[PDB]
Amino acid sequence: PMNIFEMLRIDEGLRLKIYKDTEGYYTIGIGHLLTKSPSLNAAKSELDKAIGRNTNGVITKDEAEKLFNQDVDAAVCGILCNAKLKPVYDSLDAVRRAALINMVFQMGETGVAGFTNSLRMLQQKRWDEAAVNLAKSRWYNQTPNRAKRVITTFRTGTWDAYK
């Protein structure tokens, strides 16, 4: 069964033990940054406070899903407080909303808000035109496999790229 958790599990991974992300920072779950502190103990302290348990740096899938939903809520709130993103989000169906949230997980609300032409196209239901435009971007060149899946989601409005 496909949904936003399974989508972001594919795109960001689901890691139950603390690990270093691509910038060297302690992370867990679905891309959840614990701390920029170089101390593994600091990361474990942040994790234990968040989870309410002495984790030893290892969480369960259900705990990861709790952190993930916290992060989804934060993404949605950033979207709703952003004048470029809110009207697009308001106009989108659940699957395309998941694609927009996916972009926020990757680059943050301000980063997604920068796609001014493509966002306008999405609001206007010009799915393929938006997709063709997004595929020309620096975002796409940097992470083309993920971007292609997210763009297919905008084009089709289905989970087909994740099946």
Add this chain to the structure above:
Amino acid sequence: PMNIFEMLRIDEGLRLKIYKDTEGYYTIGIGHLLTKSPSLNAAKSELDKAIGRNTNGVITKDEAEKLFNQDVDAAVCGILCNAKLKPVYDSLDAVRRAALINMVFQMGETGVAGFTNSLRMLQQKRWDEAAVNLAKSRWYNQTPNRAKRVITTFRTGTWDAYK
């Protein structure tokens, strides 16, 4: 006279004509991203809507200061909605608040929120300990001149690094 506008003018520059930032994106003023679209016309369209004027891609200092204050307000609001940043911000004086906002301009609220040990030190008024810790960071290594000025601001609570 030193203040947050003059501080960020030194750290991010004050550019009255549209230019490409370090990621190649059209920007103006004090680090204000206009669009990620590769179209200069798109950037000019965003700018003209924001300013209320047909700018030709060139703004006045006062217009730049208006955009800057919009960006400061956005930074402060992100700080106030972040559980790691809000209590620190609430506890800081104006000058150290400017240093925290400066970090948000550079890396965003979620990025600054990652400095969990240093933030705790700031909340506890352990200025030098926070400064020594921040100077060990990847942030510092990447942009050491700016980081050193911001860290001096946290250590001293003065504008001395910008004089």
Add this chain to the structure above:
Amino acid sequence: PMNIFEMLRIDEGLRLKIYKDTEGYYTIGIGHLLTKSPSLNAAKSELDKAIGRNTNGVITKDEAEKLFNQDVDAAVCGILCNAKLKPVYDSLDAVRRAALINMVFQMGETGVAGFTNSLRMLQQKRWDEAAVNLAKSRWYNQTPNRAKRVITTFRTGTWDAYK
């Protein structure tokens, strides 16, 4: 089947035609305020913009549910940006979260944030103690049938008061 839509339908009503709320303001759906303007035309204009349709002041249940979900998202975001509400919300299960959101629909985030002792009790899983305290409140005296249902939801963690 019980859920937050059905809960708030019982507590705030589901009205498909524009009506005046208890303060005389044009409202529709599940307590969704359209405008404080005394003009029915103004209310219809706001509604038509929100729905994307020439409604004549009458919406479908599905349209009402869309507006309702917009309002739920706004409530959750206000909760997450409030230092008194966020840690309680983070700690609660889905059913008790619905009770907290219900209070936000009624009185707003700042209003719910005022229940400082009861909120602490909820965070500590002291359900009955929180419920006994809330039943002593001015909120309860003003709207005792709704408050009793919401308080039962906090006490029991079930939808029993709505069945």
Add this chain to the structure above:
Amino acid sequence: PMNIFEMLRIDEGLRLKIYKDTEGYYTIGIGHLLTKSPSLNAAKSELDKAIGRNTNGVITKDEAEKLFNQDVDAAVCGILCNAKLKPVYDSLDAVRRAALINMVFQMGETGVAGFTNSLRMLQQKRWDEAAVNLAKSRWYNQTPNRAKRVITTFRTGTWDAYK
């Protein structure tokens, strides 16, 4: 010297000792709600945490101004996250911004957002038309002395109603 602190001091009062507001709730400073709990001890506990001092329920003017600025920042952030208020606020000068913030202190962001016709008039710089419309409102009838001062501020763009 007139400014937003002095404006709201006139409209909401400046009270250095805990008092009950018009709804019976413990309040201090410039309309700052401490708690809805009927316990004066609870109110004193909230106050002491906010101030960092054992206050005995009495604060200094400077402490009141700190709480006031926290409340101004919260109002501005609510304005900036509201699709009806943000574009108006972005377009207004400092004095008229103070009038909008004043309304948020009184009735909250969602309450001010309800003035859909008057807000449009303000965005269009139709000051007198907005003022004439606001004076017809339930808000005005309920609190006519305050509303008249705030409306004069919108009409004139000066502090004249507070001199």
